[PDB]
């Protein structure tokens, strides 16, 4: 029932394509069915790749496709922190992930053939897992991510009603300034993130700044954690732009928005300490319907 | 009292590579310590990631190599010329950095080390991330590598200078191609096959007398009194599905001559005919470099 790209863990590479609709929204209906069948064919051909993919839609095209039914939290991505976090809301998101970049490339080609000239590709980012699953800053990324299919479903997959099997998606490309990061002492970097660098040990919440990344995004409501399923990867060239392509899935958009409001100063006027070396340059919210829902479009 | 080849020339079947092309911004002196630091970094990464099967090459353009060598050796080295009156453009830079291994993430760390070693002494012009595609095929859908020299023994014979001051060194050629896959897909599979000189699916050679003289194999499979002009290719696909994509062409040879003769052939300087691949892809960069032996990089001071 769930689209194949949400639940796989420990992918080695991914491709994200963000696009606008140029043609009529009805063109996305046939295109989506073609592509999900393509993914099924690639999984059969490369079973070792552990390949998954997701097709998600922006608010305006999803309202049209759904006839206004369900996805009650969906909205265009707003700016956060009054512009600290920019907004680049598009109509279509394609997320391909697997153990093999060469398979992801063939699948991305299939996606483009399926949608054809109905879409205008605005962004295409090739993510790769770095050494020790670390972000390019040198800090491990993923330790507190939900682990196992059971918990990942609980966090990311809508449980019942019209949207059952669906998920909300958030994508945001960050540009790292490693020169600025490298100017910081390792203890200062550690207080910035909220975990030790080499050992990847949590720094006690009582002993780290409230502006530390963990203090900004490890949020609880009466003791219940606001969890998300992250699929982020490093990207770029060593000599050009590089950073983290941030990608999160959640059965509720609420959990993601609460973390953004926190990071960008809207909740308590304090900003994420990571903004001293990295900045977000894109931002979008998308709705990932279930496989049955996609089949039921056309 | 002998020479050691740089680690990135001979490895076969590497799945990933990084190529950095840069110009020298200051005194050529800057390149001496940077190069020694960089090859030391490579040894460090080889020790930490033994399963990466990592190799790298540092190679120099004509002008800076003449300065670093004091004009001794590298007799065939010269700035890459235009071929075919401009059909093959020329983008001769001062420094080439070729990293290849089984792991892209390790290549990325090595590329960061290369940039930290040379620092603001260089101006990076190109940084290309190559990846092996399905069945070792070029993005055109044709297998790339079948007649490439196979095994360490033959690869050394073809790529590595055997004696004299340059023993252990090699000449390198890099050329980035931009594929127009829409133009390629307009062609019937039989026309594509006549363009390359091999069948697409099964990768069978089409006989020399059955295929046009403009076929890729007819252009580059050259013999001088029965002796093939062989080269060691390290080319890989690169790019995005929706953006620029193609083949990053890279070849090593004990003699620049073998490479130049294939380029004169492809670009119409030899017999006035040109490579049929120019019907769907074109070259947008081009340079020649000298890859010294590992010890000569250690005699840089
Ligand atoms: C520059 C961009 C970012 C980088 C480099 C980054 C890095 C990290 C690192 C190093 C960790 C600790 C290891 C772990 O548990 O994964 C982490 C945790 C986390 N990040 Fe980020 N992150 C980034 C952006 C974001 C954004 C935009 C969000 C939310 C909208 C987010 C939400 C989280 C969450 C929920 C955790 C787990 C916190 C916990 O429960 O301990 N991160 N991040
Ligand atoms: C668009 C750029 C290029 C593509 C797509 C390409 C593709 C191919 C393909 C499909 C083959 C046949 C399989 C094989 O034996 O490896 C091949 C062979 C070869 N290519 Fe290219 N090639 C390109 C550029 C070049 C260039 C620039 C040179 C030389 C300067 C070159 C020299 C060779 C050689 C020597 C062979 C082996 C020929 C033989 O002995 O049968 N190629 N190439
Ligand atoms: Mg916690
Ligand atoms: Mg032959």
User: Ligand 3 centroid vs A218 CA: distance in angstroms?
Assistant: 6
Residue B79 in tokens: 């700035």
Q: Which of B51, B123, B138, B144 is catalytic?
A: B144
- List A168's β-bridge partners, or say none: A250, A287
- Which residues of B are less than 8 Å from A122 in CB distance? none
3-state secondary structure string across A213-242 = HHHHHCCEECCEECCCEECCEEEECCCCCE
Handedness of CA B118, B123, B126, B128 (dihedral sign): positive
Please give the sequence-ordered ranges of beta strands (E in DSSP) within chain A, or none if there are none: 13-21, 52-57, 92-98, 119-128, 167-176, 220-221, 224-225, 229-230, 233-236, 242-250, 278-280, 284-288
Q: Which of A91, A141, A163, A272 is catalytic?
A: A141
**Neighbour-count burial for A216-245, b at 16+ CB within 10 Å, e otherwise:** bbbbeeeeeebbbbbbbbbbbbbbeebbbb
DSSP string spanning A46-83? -GGG--EEEEEE-HHHHHHHHTT-S-TT--PPPPBGGG
- Residue carrying the six token digits 């200078």: B161
Please give the sequence-ordered ranges of beta strands (E in DSSP) within A7-155, or none if there are none: 13-21, 52-57, 92-98, 119-128
| Half-sphere exposure (Cβ direction) of B122: Cα atoms closer than 13 Å | 28
- Which residues of B are less than 8 Å from A238 in CB distance? 18, 20, 108, 111-112, 114-115, 127
Binary contact (A237, B114; C-beta < 8 A):
no
Map out the domains of chain A as residue ranges. 1-298
Residue from A77, A133, A144 to probe ligand 1 pocket by mutation (most atoms less than 8 Å from CB): A144
Closest to B31 in 3D by CA, of B68, B57, B56: B68
Q: Is the CB of A135 under 6 A from ligand 1?
A: yes
DSSP string spanning B78-108? -PPPPBGGGTB-----SEEEEEEES-HHHHH
**Considering just the CA atoms, what is the radius of gyration of chain A in Å?**
19
What is the rounded CA–CA span in Å between residue A108 and residue A35? Answer: 10
User: Which-ligand-closest: CA of B146?
Assistant: 2
- List B129's β-bridge partners, or say none: B18
Please answer whether residues B113 and B122 qualify as being in contact, where contact means their C-beta atoms are separated by less than 8 angstroms. no
Binary contact (B105, A237; C-beta < 8 A):
no
Binary contact (B109, A101; C-beta < 8 A):
no
What atom in ligand 2 is closest to the CA of residue B222? 40
Say how many residues make up chain A.
298
Please answer whether residues B117 and B37 qualify as being in contact, where contact means their C-beta atoms are separated by less than 8 angstroms. yes
- List A55's β-bridge partners, or say none: A94
Quick one: DSSP state of residue A203? P
- Give the ranges where chain B is alpha helix by DSSP (H): 30-48, 62-69, 104-118, 152-159, 181-185, 189-196, 216-220, 256-266, 294-298
Residue B102 in tokens: 């089984």
Name the resolution in angstroms: 1.9
Residue B203 in tokens: 């990768």
- Which residues of A are less than 8 Å from B105 in CB distance? 128-131
| CA angle (B45, B47, B49) in 5-degree steps | 65
What is the rounded CA–CA span in Å between residue B189 and residue B60? Answer: 41
What atom in ligand 2 is closest to the CA of residue B145? 16
Cα B110 to chain centroid, rounded: 18
User: Ligand 4 centroid vs B268 CA: distance in angstroms?
Assistant: 21
| Half-sphere exposure (Cβ direction) of A151: Cα atoms closer than 13 Å | 11
- List A124's β-bridge partners, or say none: A17
Known catalytic residue at B163: no
Q: Is the CB of A231 under 6 A from ligand 1?
A: no
């Amino acid at each position: 029932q769930v689209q194949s790209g949400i639940l796989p863990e420990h992918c080695r590479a991914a491709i994200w394509i963000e696009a606008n609709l140029k043609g009529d929204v009805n063109a996305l209906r046939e295109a989506s069915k073609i592509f999900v069948d393509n993914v099924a064919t690639f999984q059969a051909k490369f079973p070792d790749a552990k390949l998954g993919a997701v097709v998600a839609f922006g608010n305006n095209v999803w309202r049209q496709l759904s006839g206004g039914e369900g996805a009650d939290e969906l909205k265009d991505f707003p700016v956060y922190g009054k512009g600290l976090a920019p907004s680049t809301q598009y109509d279509l998101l394609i997320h391909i992930l697997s153990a093999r970049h060469e398979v992801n490339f063939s699948v991305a080609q299939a996606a483009l053939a399926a949608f054809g000239d109905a879409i205008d590709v605005k962004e295409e980012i090739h993510g790769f897992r770095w050494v020790e699953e670390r972000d390019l800053s040198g800090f491990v990324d993923g330790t507190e991510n939900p682990a196992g299919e059971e918990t990942r479903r609980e966090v990311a997959v809508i449980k019942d009603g019209v949207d059952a099997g669906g998920s909300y998606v958030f994508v945001q490309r960050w540009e790292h300034n490693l020169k600025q990061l490298n100017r910081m002492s390792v203890p200062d970097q550690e207080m910035m993130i909220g975990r030790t660098k080499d050992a990847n040990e949590e720094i006690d919440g009582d002993e780290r700044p409230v502006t530390s990344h963990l203090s900004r995004v490890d949020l609880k409501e009466d003791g219940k954690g606001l969890k998300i399923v992250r699929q982020s990867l490093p990207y770029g060239t060593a000599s050009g732009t590089h950073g983290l392509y941030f990608c999160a899935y959640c059965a509720r958009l609420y959990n993601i928005e609460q973390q953004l409001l926190s990071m960008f100063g809207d909740t308590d006027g304090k900003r994420d300490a990571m903004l001293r070396f990295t900045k977000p340059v894109t931002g979008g919210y998308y709705f990932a319907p279930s496989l049955e829902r996609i089949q039921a479009l056309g």
